[PDB]
Short mmCIF file of N, CA and C in Angstrom, two decimals:
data_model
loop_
_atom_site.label_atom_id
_atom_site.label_comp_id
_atom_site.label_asym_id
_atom_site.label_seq_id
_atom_site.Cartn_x
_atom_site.Cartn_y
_atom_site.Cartn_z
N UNK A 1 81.10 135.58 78.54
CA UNK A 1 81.69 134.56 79.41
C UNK A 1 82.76 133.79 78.63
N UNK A 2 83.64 133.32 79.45
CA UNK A 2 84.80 132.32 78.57
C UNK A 2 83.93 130.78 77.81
N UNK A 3 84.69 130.21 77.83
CA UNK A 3 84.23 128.81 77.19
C UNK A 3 84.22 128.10 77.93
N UNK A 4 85.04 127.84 79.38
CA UNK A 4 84.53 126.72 80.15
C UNK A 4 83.18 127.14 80.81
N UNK A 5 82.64 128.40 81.11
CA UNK A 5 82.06 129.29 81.89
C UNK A 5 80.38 128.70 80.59
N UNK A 6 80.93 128.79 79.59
CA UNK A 6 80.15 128.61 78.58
C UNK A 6 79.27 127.21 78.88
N UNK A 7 80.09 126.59 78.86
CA UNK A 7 80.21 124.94 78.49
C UNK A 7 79.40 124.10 79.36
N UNK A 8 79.42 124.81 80.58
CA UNK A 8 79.37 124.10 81.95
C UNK A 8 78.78 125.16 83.27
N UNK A 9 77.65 125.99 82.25
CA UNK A 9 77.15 127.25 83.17
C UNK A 9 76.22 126.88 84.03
N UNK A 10 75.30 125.49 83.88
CA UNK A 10 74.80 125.22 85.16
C UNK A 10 75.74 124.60 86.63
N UNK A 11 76.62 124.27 86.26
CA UNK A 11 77.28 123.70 86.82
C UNK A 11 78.11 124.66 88.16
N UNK A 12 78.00 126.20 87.59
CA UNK A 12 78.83 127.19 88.48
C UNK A 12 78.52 127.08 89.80
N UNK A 13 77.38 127.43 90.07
CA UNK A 13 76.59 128.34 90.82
C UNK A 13 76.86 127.50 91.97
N UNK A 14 76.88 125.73 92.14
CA UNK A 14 76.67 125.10 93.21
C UNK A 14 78.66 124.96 94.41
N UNK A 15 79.35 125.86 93.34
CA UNK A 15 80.90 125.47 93.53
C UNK A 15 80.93 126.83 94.13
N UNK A 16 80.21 127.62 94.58
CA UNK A 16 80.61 128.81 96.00
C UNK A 16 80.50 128.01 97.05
N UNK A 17 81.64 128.73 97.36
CA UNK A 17 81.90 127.99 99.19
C UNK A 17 81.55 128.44 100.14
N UNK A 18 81.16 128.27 101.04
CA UNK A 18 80.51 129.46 101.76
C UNK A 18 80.93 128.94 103.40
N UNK A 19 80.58 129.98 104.42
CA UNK A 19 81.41 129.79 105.42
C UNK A 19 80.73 128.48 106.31
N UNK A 20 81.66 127.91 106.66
CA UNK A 20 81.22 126.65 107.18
C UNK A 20 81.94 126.27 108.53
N UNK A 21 81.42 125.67 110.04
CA UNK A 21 82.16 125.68 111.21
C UNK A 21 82.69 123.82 110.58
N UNK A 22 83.38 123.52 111.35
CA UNK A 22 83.53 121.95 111.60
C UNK A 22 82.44 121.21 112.53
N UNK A 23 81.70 121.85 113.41
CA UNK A 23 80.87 121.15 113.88
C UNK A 23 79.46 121.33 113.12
N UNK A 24 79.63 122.74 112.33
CA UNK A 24 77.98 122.39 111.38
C UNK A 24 78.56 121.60 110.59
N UNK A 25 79.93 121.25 110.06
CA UNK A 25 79.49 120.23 108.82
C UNK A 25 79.81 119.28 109.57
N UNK A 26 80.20 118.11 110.49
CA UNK A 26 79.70 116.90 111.84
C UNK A 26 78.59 117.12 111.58
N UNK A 27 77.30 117.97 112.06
CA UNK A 27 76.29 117.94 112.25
C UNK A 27 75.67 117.80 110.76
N UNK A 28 75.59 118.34 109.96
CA UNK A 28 75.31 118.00 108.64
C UNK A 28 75.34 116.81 108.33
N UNK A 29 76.89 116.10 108.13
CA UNK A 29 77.21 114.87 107.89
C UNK A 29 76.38 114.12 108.85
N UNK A 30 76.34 113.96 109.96
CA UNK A 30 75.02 112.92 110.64
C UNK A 30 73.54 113.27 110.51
N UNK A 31 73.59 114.34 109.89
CA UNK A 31 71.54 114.57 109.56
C UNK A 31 71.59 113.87 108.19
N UNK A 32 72.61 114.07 107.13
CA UNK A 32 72.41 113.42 106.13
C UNK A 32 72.69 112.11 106.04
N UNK A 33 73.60 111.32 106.77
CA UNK A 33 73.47 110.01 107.04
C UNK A 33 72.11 109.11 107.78
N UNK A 34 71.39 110.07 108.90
CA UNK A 34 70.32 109.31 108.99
C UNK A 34 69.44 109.48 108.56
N UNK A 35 68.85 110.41 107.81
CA UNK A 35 67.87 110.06 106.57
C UNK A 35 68.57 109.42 105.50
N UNK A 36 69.52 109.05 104.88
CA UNK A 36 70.11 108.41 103.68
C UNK A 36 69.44 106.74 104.72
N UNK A 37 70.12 106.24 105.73
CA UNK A 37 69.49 105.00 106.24
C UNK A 37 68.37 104.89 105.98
N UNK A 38 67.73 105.84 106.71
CA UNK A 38 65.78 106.27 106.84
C UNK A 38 65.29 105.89 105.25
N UNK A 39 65.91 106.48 104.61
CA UNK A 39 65.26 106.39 103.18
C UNK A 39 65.99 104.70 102.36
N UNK A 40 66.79 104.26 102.74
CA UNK A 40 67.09 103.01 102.04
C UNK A 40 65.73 101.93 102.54
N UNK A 41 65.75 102.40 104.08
CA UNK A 41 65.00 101.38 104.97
C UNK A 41 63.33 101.18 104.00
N UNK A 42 63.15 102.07 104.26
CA UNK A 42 62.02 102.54 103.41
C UNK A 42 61.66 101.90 101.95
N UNK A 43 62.97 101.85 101.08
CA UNK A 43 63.07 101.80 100.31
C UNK A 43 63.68 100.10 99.79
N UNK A 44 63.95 99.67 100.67
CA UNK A 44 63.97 98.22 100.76
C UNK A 44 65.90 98.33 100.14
N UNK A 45 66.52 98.78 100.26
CA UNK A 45 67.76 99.25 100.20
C UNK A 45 68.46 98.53 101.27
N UNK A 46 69.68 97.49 101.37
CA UNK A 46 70.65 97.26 101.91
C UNK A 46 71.49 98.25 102.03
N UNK A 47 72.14 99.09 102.96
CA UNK A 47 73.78 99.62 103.33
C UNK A 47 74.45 99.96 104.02
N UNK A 48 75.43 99.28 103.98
CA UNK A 48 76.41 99.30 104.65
C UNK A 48 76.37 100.37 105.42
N UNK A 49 77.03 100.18 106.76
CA UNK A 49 77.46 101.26 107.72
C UNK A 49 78.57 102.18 107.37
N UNK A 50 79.75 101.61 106.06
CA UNK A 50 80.54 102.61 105.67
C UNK A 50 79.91 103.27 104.54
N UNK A 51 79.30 102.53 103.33
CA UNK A 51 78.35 103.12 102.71
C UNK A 51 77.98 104.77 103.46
N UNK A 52 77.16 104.14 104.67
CA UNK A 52 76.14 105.15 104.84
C UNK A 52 76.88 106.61 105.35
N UNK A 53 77.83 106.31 105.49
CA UNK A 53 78.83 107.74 105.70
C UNK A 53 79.20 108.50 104.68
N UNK A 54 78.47 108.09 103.42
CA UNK A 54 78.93 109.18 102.80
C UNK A 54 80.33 109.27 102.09
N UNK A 55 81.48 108.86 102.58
CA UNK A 55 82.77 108.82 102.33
C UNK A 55 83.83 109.38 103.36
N UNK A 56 82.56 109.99 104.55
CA UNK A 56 83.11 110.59 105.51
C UNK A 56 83.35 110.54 106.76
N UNK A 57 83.39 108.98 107.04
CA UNK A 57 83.52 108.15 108.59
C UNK A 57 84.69 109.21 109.82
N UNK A 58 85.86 109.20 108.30
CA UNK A 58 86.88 109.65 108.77
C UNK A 58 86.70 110.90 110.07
N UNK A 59 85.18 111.48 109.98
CA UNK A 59 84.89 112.61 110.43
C UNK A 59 83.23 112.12 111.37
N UNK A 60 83.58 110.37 111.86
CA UNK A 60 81.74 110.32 112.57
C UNK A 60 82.29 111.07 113.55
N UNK A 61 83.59 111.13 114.34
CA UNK A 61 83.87 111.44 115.81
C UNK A 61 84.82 113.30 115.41
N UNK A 62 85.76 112.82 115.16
CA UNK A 62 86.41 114.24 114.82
C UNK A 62 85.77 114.74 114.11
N UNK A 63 85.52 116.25 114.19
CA UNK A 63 85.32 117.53 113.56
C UNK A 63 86.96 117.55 112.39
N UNK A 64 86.46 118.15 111.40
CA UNK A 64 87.54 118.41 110.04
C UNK A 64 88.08 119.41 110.86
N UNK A 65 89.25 119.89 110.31
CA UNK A 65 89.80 121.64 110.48
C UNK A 65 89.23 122.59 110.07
N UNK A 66 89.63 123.57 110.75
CA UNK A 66 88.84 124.60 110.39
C UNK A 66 89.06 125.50 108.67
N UNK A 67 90.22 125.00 108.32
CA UNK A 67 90.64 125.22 106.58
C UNK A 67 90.10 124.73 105.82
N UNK A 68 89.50 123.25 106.20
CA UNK A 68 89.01 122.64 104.92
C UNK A 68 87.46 122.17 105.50
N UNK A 69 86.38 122.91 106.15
CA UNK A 69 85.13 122.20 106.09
C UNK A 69 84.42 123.09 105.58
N UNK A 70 84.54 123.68 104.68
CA UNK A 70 83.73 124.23 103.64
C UNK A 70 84.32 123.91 102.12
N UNK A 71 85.29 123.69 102.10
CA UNK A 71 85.43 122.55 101.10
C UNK A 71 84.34 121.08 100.92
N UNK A 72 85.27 120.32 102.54
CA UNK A 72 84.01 119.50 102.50
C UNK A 72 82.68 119.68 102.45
N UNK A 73 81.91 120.30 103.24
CA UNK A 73 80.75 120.88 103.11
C UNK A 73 79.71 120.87 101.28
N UNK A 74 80.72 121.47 100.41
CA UNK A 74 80.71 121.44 99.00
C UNK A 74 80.39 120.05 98.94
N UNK A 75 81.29 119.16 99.22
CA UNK A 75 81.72 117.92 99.01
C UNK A 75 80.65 116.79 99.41
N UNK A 76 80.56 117.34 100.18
CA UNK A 76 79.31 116.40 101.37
C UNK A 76 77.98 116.27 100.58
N UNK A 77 77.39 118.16 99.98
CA UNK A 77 76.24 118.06 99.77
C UNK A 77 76.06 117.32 98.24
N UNK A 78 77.05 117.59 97.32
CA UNK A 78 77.56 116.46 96.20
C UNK A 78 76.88 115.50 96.14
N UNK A 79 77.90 114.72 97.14
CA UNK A 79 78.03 113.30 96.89
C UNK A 79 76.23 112.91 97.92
N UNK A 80 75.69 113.53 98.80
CA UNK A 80 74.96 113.51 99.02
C UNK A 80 73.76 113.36 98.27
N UNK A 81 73.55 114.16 97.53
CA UNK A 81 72.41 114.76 96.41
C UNK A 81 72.98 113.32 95.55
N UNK A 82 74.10 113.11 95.38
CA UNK A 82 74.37 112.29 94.43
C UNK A 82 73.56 110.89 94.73
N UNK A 83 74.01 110.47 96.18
CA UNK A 83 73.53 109.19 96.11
C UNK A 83 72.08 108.82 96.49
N UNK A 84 71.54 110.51 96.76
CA UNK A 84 69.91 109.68 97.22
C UNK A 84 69.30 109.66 95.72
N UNK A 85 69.84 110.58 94.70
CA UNK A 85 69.01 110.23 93.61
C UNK A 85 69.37 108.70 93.28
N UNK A 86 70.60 108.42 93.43
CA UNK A 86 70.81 106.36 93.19
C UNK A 86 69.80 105.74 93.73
N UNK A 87 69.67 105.99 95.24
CA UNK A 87 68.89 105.81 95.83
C UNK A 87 67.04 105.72 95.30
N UNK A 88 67.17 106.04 94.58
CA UNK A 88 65.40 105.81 93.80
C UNK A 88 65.22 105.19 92.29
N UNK A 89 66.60 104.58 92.31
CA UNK A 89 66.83 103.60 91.35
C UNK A 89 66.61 102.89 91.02
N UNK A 90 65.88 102.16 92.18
CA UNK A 90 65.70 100.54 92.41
C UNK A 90 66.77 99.76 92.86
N UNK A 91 67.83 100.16 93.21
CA UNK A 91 68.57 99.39 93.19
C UNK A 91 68.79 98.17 94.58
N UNK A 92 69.65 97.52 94.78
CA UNK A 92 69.33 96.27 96.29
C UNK A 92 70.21 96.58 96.76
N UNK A 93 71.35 97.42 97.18
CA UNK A 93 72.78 97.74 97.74
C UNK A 93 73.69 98.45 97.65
N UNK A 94 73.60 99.40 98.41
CA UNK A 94 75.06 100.06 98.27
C UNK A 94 75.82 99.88 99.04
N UNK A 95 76.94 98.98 98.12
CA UNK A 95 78.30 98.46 98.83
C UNK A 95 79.78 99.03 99.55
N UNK A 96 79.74 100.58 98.74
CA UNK A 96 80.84 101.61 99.47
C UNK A 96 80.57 102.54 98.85
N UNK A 97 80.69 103.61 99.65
CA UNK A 97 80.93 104.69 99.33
C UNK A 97 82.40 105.17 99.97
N UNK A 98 83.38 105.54 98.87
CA UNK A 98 85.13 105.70 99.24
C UNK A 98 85.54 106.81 98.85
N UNK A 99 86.01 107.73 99.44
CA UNK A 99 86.00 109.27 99.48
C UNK A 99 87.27 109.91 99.74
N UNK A 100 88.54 109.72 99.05
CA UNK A 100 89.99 109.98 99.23
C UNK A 100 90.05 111.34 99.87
N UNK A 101 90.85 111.60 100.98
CA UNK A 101 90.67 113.26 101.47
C UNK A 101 91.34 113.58 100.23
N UNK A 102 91.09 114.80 100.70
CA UNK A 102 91.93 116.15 99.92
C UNK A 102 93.06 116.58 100.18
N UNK A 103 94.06 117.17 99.84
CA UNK A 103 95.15 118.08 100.05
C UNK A 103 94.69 119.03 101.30
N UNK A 104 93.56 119.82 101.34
CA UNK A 104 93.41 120.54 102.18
C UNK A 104 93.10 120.13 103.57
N UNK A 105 93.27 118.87 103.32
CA UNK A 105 92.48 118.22 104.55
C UNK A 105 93.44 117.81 105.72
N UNK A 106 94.87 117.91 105.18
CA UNK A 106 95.79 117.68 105.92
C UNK A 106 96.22 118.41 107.15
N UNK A 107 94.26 126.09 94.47
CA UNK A 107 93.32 125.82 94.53
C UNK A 107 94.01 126.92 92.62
N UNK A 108 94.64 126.52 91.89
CA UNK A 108 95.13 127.74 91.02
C UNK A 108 94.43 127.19 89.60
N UNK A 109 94.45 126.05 89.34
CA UNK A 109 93.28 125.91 88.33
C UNK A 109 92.13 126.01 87.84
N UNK A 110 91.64 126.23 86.57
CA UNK A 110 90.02 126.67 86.56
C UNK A 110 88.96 125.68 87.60
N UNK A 111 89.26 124.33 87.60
CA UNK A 111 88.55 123.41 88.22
C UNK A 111 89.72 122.98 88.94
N UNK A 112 88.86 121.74 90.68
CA UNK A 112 89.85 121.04 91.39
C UNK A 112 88.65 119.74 91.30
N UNK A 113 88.92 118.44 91.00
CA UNK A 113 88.89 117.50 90.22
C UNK A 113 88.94 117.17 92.52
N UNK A 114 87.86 116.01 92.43
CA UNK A 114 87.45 115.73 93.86
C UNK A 114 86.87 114.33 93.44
N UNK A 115 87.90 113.00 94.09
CA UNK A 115 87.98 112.07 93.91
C UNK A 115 86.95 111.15 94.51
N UNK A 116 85.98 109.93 93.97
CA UNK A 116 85.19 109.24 94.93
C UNK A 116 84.85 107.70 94.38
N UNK A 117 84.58 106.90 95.06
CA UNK A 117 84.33 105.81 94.12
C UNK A 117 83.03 105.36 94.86
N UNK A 118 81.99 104.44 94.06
CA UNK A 118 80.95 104.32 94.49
C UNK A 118 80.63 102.86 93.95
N UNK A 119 80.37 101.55 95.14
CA UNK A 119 79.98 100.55 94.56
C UNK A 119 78.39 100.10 94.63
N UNK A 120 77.91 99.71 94.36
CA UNK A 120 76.32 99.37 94.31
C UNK A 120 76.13 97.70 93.62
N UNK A 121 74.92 97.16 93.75
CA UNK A 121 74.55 96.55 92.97
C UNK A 121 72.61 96.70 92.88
N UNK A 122 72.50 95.70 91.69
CA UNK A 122 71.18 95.87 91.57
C UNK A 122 70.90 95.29 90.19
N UNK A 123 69.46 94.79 89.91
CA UNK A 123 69.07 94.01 88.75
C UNK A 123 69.18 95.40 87.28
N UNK A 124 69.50 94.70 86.42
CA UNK A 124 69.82 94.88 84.89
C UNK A 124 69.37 96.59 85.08
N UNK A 125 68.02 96.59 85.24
CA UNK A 125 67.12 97.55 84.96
C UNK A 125 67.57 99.07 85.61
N UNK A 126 67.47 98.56 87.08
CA UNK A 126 68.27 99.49 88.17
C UNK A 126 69.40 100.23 88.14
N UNK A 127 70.46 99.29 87.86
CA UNK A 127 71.87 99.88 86.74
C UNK A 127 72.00 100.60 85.88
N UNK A 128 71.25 100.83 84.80
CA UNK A 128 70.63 101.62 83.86
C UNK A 128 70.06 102.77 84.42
N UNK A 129 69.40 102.87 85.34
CA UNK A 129 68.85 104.32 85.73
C UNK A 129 69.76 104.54 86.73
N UNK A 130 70.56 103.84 87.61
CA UNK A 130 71.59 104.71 88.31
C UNK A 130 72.38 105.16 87.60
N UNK A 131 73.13 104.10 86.42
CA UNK A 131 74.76 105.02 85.38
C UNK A 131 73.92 106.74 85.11
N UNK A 132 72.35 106.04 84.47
CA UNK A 132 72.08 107.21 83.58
C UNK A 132 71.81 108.94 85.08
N UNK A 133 72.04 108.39 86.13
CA UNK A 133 71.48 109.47 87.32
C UNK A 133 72.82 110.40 87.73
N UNK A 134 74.20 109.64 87.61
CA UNK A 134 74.83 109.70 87.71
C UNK A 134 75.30 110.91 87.00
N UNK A 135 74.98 110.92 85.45
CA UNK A 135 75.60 111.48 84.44
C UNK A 135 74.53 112.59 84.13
N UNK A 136 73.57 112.55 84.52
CA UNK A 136 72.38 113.62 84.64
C UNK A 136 71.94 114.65 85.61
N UNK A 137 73.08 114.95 86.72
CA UNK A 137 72.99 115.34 87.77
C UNK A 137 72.94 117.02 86.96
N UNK A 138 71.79 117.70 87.49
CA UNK A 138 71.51 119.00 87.52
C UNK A 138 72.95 120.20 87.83
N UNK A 139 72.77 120.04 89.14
CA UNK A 139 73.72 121.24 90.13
C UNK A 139 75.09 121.17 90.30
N UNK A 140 75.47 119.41 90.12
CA UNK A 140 76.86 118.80 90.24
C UNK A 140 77.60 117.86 89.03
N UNK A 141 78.30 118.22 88.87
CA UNK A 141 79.39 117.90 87.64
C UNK A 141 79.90 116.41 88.74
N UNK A 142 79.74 115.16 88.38
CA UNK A 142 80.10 114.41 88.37
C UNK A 142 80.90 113.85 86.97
N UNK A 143 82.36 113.65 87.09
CA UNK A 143 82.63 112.97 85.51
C UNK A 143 83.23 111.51 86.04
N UNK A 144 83.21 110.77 85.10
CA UNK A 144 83.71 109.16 84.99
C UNK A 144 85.11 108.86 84.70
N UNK A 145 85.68 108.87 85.74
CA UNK A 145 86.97 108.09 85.60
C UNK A 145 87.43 106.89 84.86
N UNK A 146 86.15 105.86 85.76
CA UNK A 146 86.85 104.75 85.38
C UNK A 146 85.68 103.77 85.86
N UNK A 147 84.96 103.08 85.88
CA UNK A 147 83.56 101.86 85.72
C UNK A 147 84.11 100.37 85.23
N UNK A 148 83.11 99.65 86.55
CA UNK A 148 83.26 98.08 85.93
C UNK A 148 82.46 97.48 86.51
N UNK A 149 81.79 97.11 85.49
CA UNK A 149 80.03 96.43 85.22
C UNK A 149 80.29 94.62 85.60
N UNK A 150 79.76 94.16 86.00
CA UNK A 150 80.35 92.81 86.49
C UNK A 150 78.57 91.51 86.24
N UNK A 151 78.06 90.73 85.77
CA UNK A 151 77.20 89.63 86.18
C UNK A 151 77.78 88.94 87.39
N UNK A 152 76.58 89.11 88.75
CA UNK A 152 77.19 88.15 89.68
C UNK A 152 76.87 86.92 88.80
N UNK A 153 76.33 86.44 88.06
CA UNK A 153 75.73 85.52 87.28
C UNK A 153 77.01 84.43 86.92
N UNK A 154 69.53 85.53 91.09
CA UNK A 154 68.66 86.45 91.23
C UNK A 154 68.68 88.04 89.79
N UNK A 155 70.08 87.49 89.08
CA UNK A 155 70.25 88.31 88.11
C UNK A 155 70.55 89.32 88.63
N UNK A 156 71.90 89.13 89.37
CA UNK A 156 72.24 90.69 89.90
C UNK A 156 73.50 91.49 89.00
N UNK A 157 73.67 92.50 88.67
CA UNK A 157 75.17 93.03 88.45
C UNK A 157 75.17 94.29 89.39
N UNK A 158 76.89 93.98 89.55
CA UNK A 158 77.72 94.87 90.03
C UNK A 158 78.44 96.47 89.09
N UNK A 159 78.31 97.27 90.22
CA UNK A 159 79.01 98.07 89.79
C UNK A 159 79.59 99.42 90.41
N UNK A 160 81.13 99.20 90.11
CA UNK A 160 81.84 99.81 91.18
C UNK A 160 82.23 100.85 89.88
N UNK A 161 82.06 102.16 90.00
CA UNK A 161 82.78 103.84 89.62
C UNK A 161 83.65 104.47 90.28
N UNK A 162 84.50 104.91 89.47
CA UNK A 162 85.31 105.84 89.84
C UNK A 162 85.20 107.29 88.82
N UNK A 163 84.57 108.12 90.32
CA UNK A 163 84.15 109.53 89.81
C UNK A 163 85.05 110.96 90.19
N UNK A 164 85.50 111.59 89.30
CA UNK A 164 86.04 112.82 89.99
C UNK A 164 84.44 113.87 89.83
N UNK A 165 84.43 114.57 90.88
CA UNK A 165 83.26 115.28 91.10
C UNK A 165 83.98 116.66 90.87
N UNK A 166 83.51 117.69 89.67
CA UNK A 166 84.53 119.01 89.48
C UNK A 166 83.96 119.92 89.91
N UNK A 167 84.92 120.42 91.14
CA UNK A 167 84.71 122.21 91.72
C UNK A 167 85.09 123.18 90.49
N UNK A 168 84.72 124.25 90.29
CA UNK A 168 85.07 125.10 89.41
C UNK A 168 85.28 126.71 90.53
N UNK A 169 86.50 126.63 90.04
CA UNK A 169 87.28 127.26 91.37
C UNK A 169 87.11 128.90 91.00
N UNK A 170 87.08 129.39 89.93
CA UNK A 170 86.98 130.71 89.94
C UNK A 170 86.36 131.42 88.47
N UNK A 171 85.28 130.98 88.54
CA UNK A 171 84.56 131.46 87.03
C UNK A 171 84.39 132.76 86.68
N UNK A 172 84.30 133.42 85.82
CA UNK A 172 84.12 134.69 85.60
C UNK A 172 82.73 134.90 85.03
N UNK A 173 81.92 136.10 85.81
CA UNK A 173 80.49 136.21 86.02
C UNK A 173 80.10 137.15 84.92
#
């Protein structure tokens, strides 16, 4: 195998795309939004109604095109997987979830770098096991742009990320 292939071999397997309609991923995107509620509720979790989209409001009513919802799809189950593990953090809020489209939404590098930002808050403790959930993700390559840790100072801090989430576009097997 090469060296990125090397480097980052769990990471392959979850970046096949596979065929996807625009109304299974609509339908996706609202099964995973109401258990993400279901489970905050549960969980004594505040969030937001844009929060709870995922990053993907842009799409509660329109269906994506038919070029790019298996992109999203990729994208969806990501940031998905991403935030219910936050989600058992402890944490008291998630304040946005912000999800820049894509180019396709309107591929020649080893990776395509998939933009998102994620705000939350929650006591000292909580923060600590979300950064560390973040950066521990199994199936999905989340990397760190850019973070800012804030004391509202109930002893709460803030904290808003900026994550590129990396597709790996054509690995050699």
């Amino acid at each position: 195998v090469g060296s990125l292939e090397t480097a980052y071999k769990p990471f392959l397997a979850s970046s096949a795309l596979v065929p996807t309609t625009p109304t299974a991923f609509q339908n996706e995107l609202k099964t995973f939004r109401d258990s993400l509620i279901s489970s905050c509720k549960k969980k004594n979790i505040l969030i937001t109604d844009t929060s709870s989209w995922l990053g993907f409001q842009v799409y509660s009513t329109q269906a994506p095109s038919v070029q790019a919802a298996s992109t999203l799809g990729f994208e969806l189950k990501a940031i998905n997987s991403l935030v219910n593990k936050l989600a058992e953090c402890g944490l008291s809020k998630f304040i946005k979830v912000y999800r820049p489209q894509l180019p396709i939404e309107t591929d020649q590098a080893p990776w395509t770098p998939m933009p998102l930002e994620i705000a939350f808050q929650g006591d000292r403790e909580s923060v600590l096991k979300a950064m560390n959930a973040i950066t521990g993700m199994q199936d999905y390559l989340f990397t760190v742009n850019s973070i800012r840790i804030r004391n509202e100072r109930k002893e709460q801090v803030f904290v808003q990320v900026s994550l590129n989430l990396v597709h790996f576009n054509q690995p050699k097997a």
